[PDB]
Ligand binder design. Structure first.
Ligand SMILES: Nc1nc2c([nH]c(=O)n2[C@H]2C[C@H](O)[C@@H](COP(=O)(O)OP(=O)(O)O)O2)c(=O)[nH]1
Ligand SMILES: [Mg+2]
Length: 291
């Protein structure tokens, strides 16, 4: 059996980057915060939970730092790691962690004993970490254009898609979503309506980011993407299957960013990490009810 886990390089602004290293009595080891996925939990949601459970900090996830695989007695441990900025809380000793230290990255590398954690910290230092995040979401499942009676623009999410929309709230809050944009289609708006309620935030309607608009004027949609991305906060943009591959691929080619994963599924999220207006990460997340 392979055990699926997620964790983070939790860091704070000391005033100046310091990274958290945790000590576990059981092993007498120093490592990065991580833990197993609960039933129905996505990797990002688990990473955020495990930060809170092991360090007592609240954090916002940024750039994905790849995956590690190592043997355990039970078989194989597989862990996805995120950069995560502390936004609050404080260390409290718990059932697994008795000590936490905050170190500059060079001192943290020496403190970490496992090769796979040092691999992860090397990925963390290679690019900026004080990032802002654009979250590009394909709308949830919404049935078939082929069977819909009515204006197709009005076609609503189906039951599965409404569940994806509810499950995206925890997914997008883990990345500190703060502002909301949707293509001018009901199924796009309904996908981030639950997040809108959680944030008490209005969704801005985007006629330039529909399939029809994108197909006829790609350049207007690319400019509007960069305009949204330039605004303060972490925007969510919910759009359609025939828009997202083109925008992501165009931005990754121009920035020379290589996505480690890829897909275009209904309910999927691209996590675009920006530092000083430059793309530094493009992280594909499966739909919350897939994997
Ligand atoms: N945390 C961690 N443990 C590692 C790594 N490499 C390695 O060999 N180990 C060892 C530490 C242990 O010997 C073993 C399992 O530790 P864990 O995955 O933390 O699982 P548990 O929380 O106990 O369920 O792998 C590594 O990169 N990180
Ligand atoms: Mg753990």
């Amino acid at each position: 059996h392979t055990v699926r886990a997620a964790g983070a390089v939790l860091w704070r602004d000391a005033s100046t980057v310091e990274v958290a290293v945790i000590h576990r009595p059981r092993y007498d080891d120093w490592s990065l915060p991580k833990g197993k996925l609960d039933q129905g939990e996505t990797e990002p949601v688990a990473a955020a939970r495990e930060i809170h459970e092991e360090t007592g900090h609240t954090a916002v996830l940024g750039r994905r730092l790849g995956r590690v695989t190592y043997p355990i007695p039970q078989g194989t441990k597989r862990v996805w790691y995120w950069a995560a900025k502390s936004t609050g809380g404080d260390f409290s000793p718990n059932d697994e962690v008795d000590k936490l230290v905050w170190l500059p990255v060079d001192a943290a590398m020496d403190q970490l004993q496992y090769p796979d954690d040092r691999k992860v910290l090397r990925r963390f230092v290679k690019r900026p970490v004080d990032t802002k995040t654009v979250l590009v979401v394909r709308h949830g499942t919404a049935g078939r254009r082929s069977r819909y009676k009515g204006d197709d623009r009005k076609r609503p999410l189906d039951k599965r898609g409404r569940a994806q929309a509810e499950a995206l709230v925890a997914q997008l809050m883990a990345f500190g979503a703060t502002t909301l944009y949707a293509a001018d289609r009901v199924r796009c708006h309904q996908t981030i309506e639950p997040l809108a309620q959680e944030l008490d935030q209005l969704i801005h309607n985007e006629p330039l980011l529909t399939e029809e608009a994108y197909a006829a004027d790609h350049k207007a949609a690319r400019k509007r993407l960069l305009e949204i991305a330039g605004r303060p906060g972490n925007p969510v943009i919910c759009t359609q299957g025939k828009v997202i591959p083109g925008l992501i691929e165009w931005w990754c080619e121009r920035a020379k960013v290589r996505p480690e994963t890829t897909g275009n599924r209904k309910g999927s999220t691209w996590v675009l990490s920006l530092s000083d207006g430059e793309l530094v990460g493009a992280d594909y997340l499966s739909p919350p009810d897939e994997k």
